[PDB]
Amino acid sequence: SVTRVPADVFINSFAAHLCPAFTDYVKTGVSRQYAPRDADWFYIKAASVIRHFYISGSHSIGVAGLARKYSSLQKGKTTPHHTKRASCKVIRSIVSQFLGGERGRHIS
Amino acid sequence: TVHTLGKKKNSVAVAFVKAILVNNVPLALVRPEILRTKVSEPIMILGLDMNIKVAGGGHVSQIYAVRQAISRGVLASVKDEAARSELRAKLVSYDRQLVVSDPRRCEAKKFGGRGARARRQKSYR
Amino acid sequence: EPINARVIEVLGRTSSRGGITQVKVEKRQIIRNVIGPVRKDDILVLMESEREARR
Amino acid sequence: KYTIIVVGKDLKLVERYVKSIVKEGRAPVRRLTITTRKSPCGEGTNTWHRFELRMYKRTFWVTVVIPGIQVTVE
Amino acid sequence: DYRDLLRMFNTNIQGKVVLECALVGIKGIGRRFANVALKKANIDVHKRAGELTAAEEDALMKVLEDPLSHGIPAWMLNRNNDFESGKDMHILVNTIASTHRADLERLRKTRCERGVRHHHNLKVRGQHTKSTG
Amino acid sequence: SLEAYISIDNHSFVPHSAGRWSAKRFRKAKCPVVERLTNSLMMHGRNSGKKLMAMKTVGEAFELINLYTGKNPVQVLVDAVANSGPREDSCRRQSVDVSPLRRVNIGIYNIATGARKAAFRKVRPFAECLAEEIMNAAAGADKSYAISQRNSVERIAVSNR
RNA sequence: AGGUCUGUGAUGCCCUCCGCCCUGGGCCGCACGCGCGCUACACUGGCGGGGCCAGCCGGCGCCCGCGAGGACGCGAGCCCCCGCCGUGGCCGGGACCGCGGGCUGGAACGCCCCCGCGCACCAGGAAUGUCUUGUAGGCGCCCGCCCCCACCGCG
RNA sequence: ACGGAGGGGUACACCAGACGUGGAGUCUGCGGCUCAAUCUGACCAACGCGCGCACCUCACCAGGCCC
Ligand SMILES: [K+]
Ligand SMILES: [K+]
Ligand SMILES: [K+]
Ligand SMILES: [K+]
Ligand SMILES: [K+]
Ligand SMILES: [K+]
Numbered sequence: 001s002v003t004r005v006p007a008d009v010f011i012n013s014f015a016a017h018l019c020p021a022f023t024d025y026v027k028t029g030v031s032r033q034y035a036p037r038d039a040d041w042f043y044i045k046a047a048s049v050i051r052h053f054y055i056s057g058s059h060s061i062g063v064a065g066l067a068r069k070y071s072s073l074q075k076g077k078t079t080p081h082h083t084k085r086a087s088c089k090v091i092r093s094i095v096s097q098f099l100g101g102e103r104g105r106h107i108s
Numbered sequence: 109t110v111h112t113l114g115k116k117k118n119s120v121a122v123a124f125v126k127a128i129l130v131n132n133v134p135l136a137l138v139r140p141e142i143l144r145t146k147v148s149e150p151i152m153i154l155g156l157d158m159n160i161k162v163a164g165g166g167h168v169s170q171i172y173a174v175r176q177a178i179s180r181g182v183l184a185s186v187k188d189e190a191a192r193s194e195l196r197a198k199l200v201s202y203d204r205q206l207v208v209s210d211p212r213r214c215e216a217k218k219f220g221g222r223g224a225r226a227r228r229q230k231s232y233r
Numbered sequence: 234e235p236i237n238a239r240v241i242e243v244l245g246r247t248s249s250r251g252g253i254t255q256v257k258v259e260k261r262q263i264i265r266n267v268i269g270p271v272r273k274d275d276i277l278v279l280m281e282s283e284r285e286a287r288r
Numbered sequence: 289k290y291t292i293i294v295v296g297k298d299l300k301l302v303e304r305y306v307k308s309i310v311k312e313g314r315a316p317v318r319r320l321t322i323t324t325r326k327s328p329c330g331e332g333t334n335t336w337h338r339f340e341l342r343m344y345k346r347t348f349w350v351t352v353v354i355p356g357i358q359v360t361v362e
Numbered sequence: 363d364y365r366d367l368l369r370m371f372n373t374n375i376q377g378k379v380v381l382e383c384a385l386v387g388i389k390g391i392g393r394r395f396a397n398v399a400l401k402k403a404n405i406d407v408h409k410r411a412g413e414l415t416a417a418e419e420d421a422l423m424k425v426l427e428d429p430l431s432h433g434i435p436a437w438m439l440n441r442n443n444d445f446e447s448g449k450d451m452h453i454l455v456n457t458i459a460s461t462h463r464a465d466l467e468r469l470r471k472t473r474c475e476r477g478v479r480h481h482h483n484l485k486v487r488g489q490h491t492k493s494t495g
Numbered sequence: 496s497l498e499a500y501i502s503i504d505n506h507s508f509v510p511h512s513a514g515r516w517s518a519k520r521f522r523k524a525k526c527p528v529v530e531r532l533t534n535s536l537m538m539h540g541r542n543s544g545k546k547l548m549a550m551k552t553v554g555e556a557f558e559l560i561n562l563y564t565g566k567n568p569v570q571v572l573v574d575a576v577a578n579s580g581p582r583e584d585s586c587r588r589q590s591v592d593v594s595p596l597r598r599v600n601i602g603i604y605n606i607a608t609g610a611r612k613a614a615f616r617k618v619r620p621f622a623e624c625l626a627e628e629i630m631n632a633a634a635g636a637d638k639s640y641a642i643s644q645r646n647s648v649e650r651i652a653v654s655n656r
Numbered sequence: 657a658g659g660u661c662u663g664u665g666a667u668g669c670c671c672u673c674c675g676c677c678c679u680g681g682g683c684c685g686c687a688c689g690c691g692c693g694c695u696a697c698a699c700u701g702g703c704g705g706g707g708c709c710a711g712c713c714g715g716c717g718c719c720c721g722c723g724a725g726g727a728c729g730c731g732a733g734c735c736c737c738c739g740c741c742g743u744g745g746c747c748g749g750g751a752c753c754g755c756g757g758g759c760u761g762g763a764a765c766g767c768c769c770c771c772g773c774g775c776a777c778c779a780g781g782a783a784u785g786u787c788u789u790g791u792a793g794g795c796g797c798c799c800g801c802c803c804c805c806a807c808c809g810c811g
Numbered sequence: 812a813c814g815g816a817g818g819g820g821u822a823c824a825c826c827a828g829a830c831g832u833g834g835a836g837u838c839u840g841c842g843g844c845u846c847a848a849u850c851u852g853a854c855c856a857a858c859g860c861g862c863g864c865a866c867c868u869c870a871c872c873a874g875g876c877c878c
Binding site: 379380382383389390391393395435437438440441442443444450458461462465480484486490492493494 | 686689690766
């Protein structure tokens, strides 16, 4: 199956096998202080989100369930560091692109 | 049909052995590629089709539960024999934790401090 | 010149605060003070064998 | 078909009640707890009382009278 | 070929150093504005600071002189909805001080608690000063 | 430092061998030396716990020793942690011989302190210091901080009798 | 003769008829000396994309909106992997301040988010505290008071 | 009861180590200052202690209804 090959190869070699403009002037979340740098990153994020959907064959994943999948910290704040979520518009839109039930969406 | 369990701190590993999978990711593809060796130690120091489901705690505990499960799941292969009696001996002469689960668990926190032994500083002035 | 010698028994803790341990090191029965943990059948490398431990 | 929910705080009474209903015939335990300074005012070593209270479900999806036991059917 | 100096906006720059960060040598600019200005101005962001051609500085100065006129969004510009012109300016220069000081001028005219705390050179933001500085 | 405290037989491949060693008394005598080392590596509150990263150093430093000397990466280790280990001490200060178990122990700590201080605020890697430091306390040269202070402790003990 | 009549229909004895309520403010004011703590002072690190694991028990789909945050409905961080910066108060450190956008609320002076502004700080004198296994320490999560809000305390 | 009296014990109190605190900014409490009021307690065993102060909680301040 797809599981028999590693994910760090799948995401990259599938972004190499695949497109909004808000891609520009966007960070992946309120955690990350900078926007990403490798401008292939939207293909890479899309390949990651699909490699993460095809895992979940029966039940329905969701988009908040996906921003919560892509999270990191907030720092430079003098306080004990807390975990924050990512953006929602980006992942919802990537799901809509890759889409062309009871809740969310699913594979095939 | 063979049942086997494995434990580290709160990690529970379930093994169905029949005449190799860990969380659907095969042996040498389990995330900690450095500790992969630690996992694969019994297989090489000592196949069948085994299958594992493990959760709980953290990465290193997952490793020490799956490894110990596979050890028991091939320890129960032969029965009532001298191999049944000496395999466990080679496992002990590797480490006794390869059979018997490790019984350490965190000690609870007691008020007036951050952990189980650290108090807060005592200032007289 | 190192003078390796071997302990044949522990007499007891010498320092007021615990610390050092009187041992019977060796064709001789020189007695010496030792800082760290020492069992029987262990080895001490001696800078000199000229002096024996008080008491 | 019939639903039975039977609840009580004392493990002995609850176990008795399930034992004396089968004389005729996942919802695990959870606990109600508080911590609170021992003294009335705020003077002295900061010691704490830790109060605790477990109460049980017993589930009877049906196809003795004990005071302190609670029953609902729904 | 590279030079070791791009002396711009009355503030010296060093070069030999990455351009996206080196452009923060200009006051009023952040790494955010550097990143959203260069690749918009069709320049690679990180090769070296001595390899920035003249027409390329020109593409810069034109993306700098009008940010909302090339798609840089409202929320990423600086002097949003000013009290000089009612319009989302781009203070991107070293004439920031005129805005700041004339602001102090207006407050010292209108006599607000915040301006007076700034006059006494203290906290203005509901922050305790019990502590001994 | 002796053949009763340098473990080179009872040891799993990589250092990591979770279990128990400080529970007894002479238990850590059978603790593999290439693990006793990494165990020390995870020192300082800024590295309290990190075991895998400490492992990324021992095996890697073992990638400069053969690339400069040409001798098995471990034979230099045992001999180096044997070269250190102050022989005497100045405990009313009298000179007292040091325990065999203790020298194996103190000397391991000494090599670590060498890199720790000689890696901070340095573009050069921390593992780089462990590298030259461990190959410096091999033949025997002051360049190795360990070899040096060992000499210093003998000077005081011989003078503090 | 620690503390507590300011927690109570516990209360003796004195004094007030200082009872109840309505609006506005203060308890949060500040040269200054103390104590308990939080974030640091970097390369054993910071940044960008990806992988993935807890327990005290616990709701989340459709969307809009850079974000925070709206309208409508139904039942984990460390760490690892790959890259960048290159010993420079640098991309360490994030205080202080200048616009905007939001939430709570009869009411912001309360809290969030976006751009900009980048303080002090180079491991700390004389002194001083705590600890023996899943322990120190590092990482994060949850509950309490709570209109909003944890650097606190119980876990 | 106490002893710079003798004797016998013991604890992370010391030994061997580790992690800290005191030096910077910052949150919080205390003092002292100011104020119409900045309500008040407690000085090892007070001082993130009297369970999160816009209003209420409030005991304090400037005024104003009712019995
Ligand atoms: K108290
Ligand atoms: K160069
Ligand atoms: K009372
Ligand atoms: K009255
Ligand atoms: K207290
Ligand atoms: K009021």
